[PDB]
Design a protein around this ligand. Structure first.
Ligand SMILES: [Mg+2]
Ligand SMILES: [Mg+2]
Ligand SMILES: [Mg+2]
Ligand SMILES: [Mg+2]
Ligand SMILES: [Mg+2]
Ligand SMILES: [Mg+2]
Ligand SMILES: [Mg+2]
Ligand SMILES: [Mg+2]
Ligand SMILES: [Mg+2]
Ligand SMILES: [Mg+2]
Ligand SMILES: [Mg+2]
Ligand SMILES: [Mg+2]
Ligand SMILES: [Mg+2]
Ligand SMILES: [Mg+2]
Ligand SMILES: [Mg+2]
Ligand SMILES: [Mg+2]
Ligand SMILES: [Mg+2]
Ligand SMILES: [Mg+2]
Ligand SMILES: [Mg+2]
Ligand SMILES: [Mg+2]
Lengths: 52, 95, 154, 325
RNA sequence: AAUUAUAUAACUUAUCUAUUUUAUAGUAUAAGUUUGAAAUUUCGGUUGGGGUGACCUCGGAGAAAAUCCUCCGAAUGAUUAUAACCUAGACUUACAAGUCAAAGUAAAAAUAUCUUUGACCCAGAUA
RNA sequence: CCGCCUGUUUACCAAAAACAUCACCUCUAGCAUUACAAGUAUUAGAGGCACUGCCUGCCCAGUGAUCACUUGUUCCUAGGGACUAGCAUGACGGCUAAACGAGGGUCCAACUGU
RNA sequence: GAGCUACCUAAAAACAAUUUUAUGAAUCAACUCGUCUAUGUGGCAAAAUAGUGAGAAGAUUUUUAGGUAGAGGUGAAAAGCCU
């Protein structure tokens, strides 16, 4: 099974995007483009949306 | 008392005119039933001595049931109207 | 004499509130379709029923009526209600899985004669396993724990 | 309007009662009830860490105790405790596989010898492969499955447990073709081969309503099972090299699907193709595993395992066949 | 079968009286809960007519652009160094939905490969 | 053969083996000024069902034997008490029974333009 | 709308002869019903006529006036009857 989760930007902005990960693995963290800051920054998982 | 409210809007009628109602305007919902409200007290001025309440001329706040069934009906008390207050206070001052 | 036994077993019958007594009686009548005479029989025979709350007595009766296929008279004669649900399920389910018990069909017939209810419940567990089921004591203990797990999952 | 499960129950009662006599009540109860799982470590990353953790919980490996390349942890006699779900390891592989311990008997008694090549004729997701891969220290291997989706399911299992490097070696190859047709393609190819014919899966048949062989529509399929089982067994018998070993395994209890299937394979092999298959006794193996397994020796061929409440690890039937030429 | 159901029958909480030192009695009514006498409404499609079966959407292979023709699969999963915004010109198509993409700008030092679902209304979640 | 019998029914295609019926059985109810009823458990209402006799009658707790253990059901903590001696099975068949019928069949005699 | 029909209330009425007995007995008129066959089929008749049949002192038949009304009434249940 897999779960849809919400990755939140740690730049101080509220920008977020949804990604997929299997429920077995650990919480995700990633680098992604933040439009409001116009730079690549870290996105850290904060909440779970749904199970798919 | 039961207070009700329409489900359906009634279009405005005008200044001197009355709205024309339809069969859908007869559907109601209950906003409140007054009997379930918290009870109030009644203000009275005693006219004769009575146990555990007072002697004479002293305003007392009593449950509505007691005031209407015992004090007023038996003549032991009078309504705390402005005139009744004025007469009793003057007698107390002169005494 | 009926009062004497009731008073000894259930001293609180007088103390109990009106509501509690009525519910036990009402369940026996409206939901269990017991006759007037049987109701007096059950109360006298097993006074503890009054203490038992409703929605548990109804389940116990329906368990026998539907799952075990017993009739009104059989329940009254054997004092079925006296026994606890845990004992009923532990023993009956064990026999059913073994194939030694059969729910009566729609026609009312059974291919194999079912064991007598007294043998199932009234007798001791050691005799019940040794004679009625011809099983081992250890197996029953394992089954009881397994049944407990299933109820927890349920 | 009998359900599929009821048909399975009815058929078992009429036949199993006669075959097993007074043991039918004991077998019947141990099927409808809960099953016991046995944890199998992944070796690799989980060789040390998880095994110590499981031992601290008092779960004891039966294979290790009996010996006193495969170690499978099982609970104490009559213990109802479960196993915690498998957890993801640091190195990137799953900690352990939980499976029916008796399902591993065909592997343990296959007489593995180093420097060999093995084939799995019909192992859909079966751990019988994953466990074999652990045993396949120095062995190239192959896998074939009739189905398509079930084949992919195996590959996913391989990812989680088998490290890629090993998979990169030709030892891991995925194929999905008819087993009987496979016999012509690769005759006398592998020294050791395991043939697990599709069986009635009695335990699953009663429990599972969906896709049950006992459904009315699948009656023709059910009736023809023994013939198809013989065909698959014969094909594997041809494929195994001269002097090779093959094992016939089934989940069912029916005498028809166990002894007749193997006897036909031997008879068909014996006459038409001028080959001789000589059975290898597993009696000593039976005694060693007495503590953790329950069985009865009536069957002429194979070591049938039955479900008992004390040790509810059945039912497994596995027969060993060695091709002398 | 779905939707209701102060027909009765029970209770419970208020309200109104009695008492009682909190307390048990009752009850021209309101709000709940339990029973159900009744009330309104309906009976998908293709498979001769039945009887058991099935089948209804999307993709792949044969017949070869027909079929109730012959078969297999799908309502995902794995790995991802994380794949922005903006915009000529086209495919596909009754409608709706679905594909591909130059230049420009921006992050970095350009595309993630495997290869398949669901409109509108109406309710959510947070910032 | 069916139904016990006299009775009843589809006005206008069915009169019967259907319905009712004496007999027998189950369920509900402790009571007054408009039915039941100016009545009160040998009473009233609701329902089922041929009668009659005749075989088949078994969920009383088991063994000892009015007595002891073993059970069971409960509590108080594996110990300690309490309760189970003011009672005591049941479920079918073949029966018919003379009489009776504008009921459905089989047969003999007589009779006749069938 | 119960002047037909279903059931009920009140007040009235009819029943020969013969054999049994002492009666939901018997033979068979009056009277009530309608088994079977033929005729008739825009018929004498929107259910009849001619024969032949069942009951006939009873749960019998008949007259007069009153009652129950359609989400209903009545029913020795034919889903019968209510112009
Ligand atoms: Mg570009
Ligand atoms: Mg008759
Ligand atoms: Mg007659
Ligand atoms: Mg009549
Ligand atoms: Mg007629
Ligand atoms: Mg007649
Ligand atoms: Mg007629
Ligand atoms: Mg009748
Ligand atoms: Mg007749
Ligand atoms: Mg003659
Ligand atoms: Mg009249
Ligand atoms: Mg008239
Ligand atoms: Mg006369
Ligand atoms: Mg008539
Ligand atoms: Mg006569
Ligand atoms: Mg006559
Ligand atoms: Mg007469
Ligand atoms: Mg009828
Ligand atoms: Mg009819
Ligand atoms: Mg008319």
């Amino acid at each position: 099974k897999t779960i849809l989760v919400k990755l939140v930007s740690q730049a101080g902005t509220g920008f977020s995007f949804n990604h997929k990960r299997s429920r077995l693995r650990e919480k995700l963290s990633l680098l992604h483009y933040d439009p409001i800051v116009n730079k690549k920054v870290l996105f850290v998982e904060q909440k779970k949306i749904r199970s798919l | 008392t039961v207070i009700v409210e329409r489900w359906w809007k009634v279009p405005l009628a005008g200044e001197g005119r009355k709205p024309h109602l339809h069969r859908r305007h007869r559907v109601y919902k209950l906003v409140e039933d007054t009997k379930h409200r918290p009870k109030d007290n009644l203000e009275l001025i005693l006219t004769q001595s009575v146990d555990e309440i007072g002697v004479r001329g002293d305003l007392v706040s009593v449950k509505k049931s007691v005031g209407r069934n015992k004090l007023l009906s038996q003549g032991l008390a009078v309504y705390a109207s402005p005139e009744n207050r004025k007469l009793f206070e003057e007698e107390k001052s002169l005494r | 004499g009926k009062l004497k036994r009731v008073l000894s077993v259930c001293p609180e019958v007088f103390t109990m509130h009106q509501r509690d007594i009525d519910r036990v009686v009402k369940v026996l009548r409206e939901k269990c379709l017991f006759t007037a005479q049987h109701i007096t029989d059950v109360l006298h025979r097993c006074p503890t029923v009054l203490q038992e709350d409703p929605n548990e007595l109804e389940y116990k009766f329906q368990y026998a009526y539907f799952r075990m296929g017993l009739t009104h008279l059989d329940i009254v004669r054997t004092n079925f209600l006296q026994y606890s649900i845990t004992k009923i399920k532990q023993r009956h389910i064990y026999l059913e899985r073994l194939g030694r018990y059969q729910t009566p069909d729609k026609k009312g017939q059974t291919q194999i004669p079912n064991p007598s209810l007294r043998n199932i419940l009234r007798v001791s567990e050691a005799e019940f396993l040794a004679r009625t089921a011809c099983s081992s004591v250890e197996e029953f203990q394992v089954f009881k724990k397994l049944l407990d797990q299933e109820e927890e999952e349920e | 309007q009998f359900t599929a499960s009821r048909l399975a129950l009815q058929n078992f009662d009429m036949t199993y009662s006669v075959q097993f006599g007074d043991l039918w009540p004991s077998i019947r109860v141990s099927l409808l009830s809960e099953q016991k799982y046995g944890a199998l470590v992944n070796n690799f990353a989980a060789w040390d860490s998880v095994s110590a953790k499981l031992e601290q919980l008092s779960a004891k490996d039966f294979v290790s105790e009996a010996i006193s390349n495969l170690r499978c942890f099982t609970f104490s006699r009559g213990d109802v405790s479960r196993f915690p779900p498998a957890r993801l390891g640091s190195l990137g592989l799953m900690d352990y596989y939980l499976m029916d311990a008796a399902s591993l008997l065909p592997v343990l008694a296959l007489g593995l010898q180093h420097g060999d090549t093995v084939l799995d004729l019909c192992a859909a997701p079966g751990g019988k492969t994953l466990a074999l891969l652990q045993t396949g220290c120095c062995r190239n291997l192959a896998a074939n499955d009739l189905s398509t989706s079930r084949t992919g399911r195996l590959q996913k299992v391989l990812h989680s447990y088998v490290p890629q490097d090993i998979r990169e070696g030709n030892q891991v190859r995925v194929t999905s073709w008819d087993g009987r047709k496979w016999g012509e393609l690769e005759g006398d190819t592998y020294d050791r081969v395991l043939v697990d014919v599709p069986c009635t899966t009695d335990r699953h048949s009663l429990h599972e309503e969906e896709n049950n062989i006992f459904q009315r529509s699948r009656k023709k399929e059910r009736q023809m099972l023994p013939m198809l089982q013989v065909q698959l067994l014969a094909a594997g018998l041809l494929a195994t090299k001269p002097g090779g070993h093959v094992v016939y395994s089934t989940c069912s209890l029916s005498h028809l699907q166990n002894e007749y299937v193997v006897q036909g394979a031997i008879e068909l092999l014996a006459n038409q193709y001028n080959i001789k298959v000589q059975v290898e006794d597993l009696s000593h193996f039976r005694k060693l595993f007495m503590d953790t397994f329950c069985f009865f020796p009536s069957c002429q061929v194979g070591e049938l395992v039955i479900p008992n409440l004390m040790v509810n690890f059945g039912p497994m039937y596995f027969c060993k066949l060695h091709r002398l030429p």
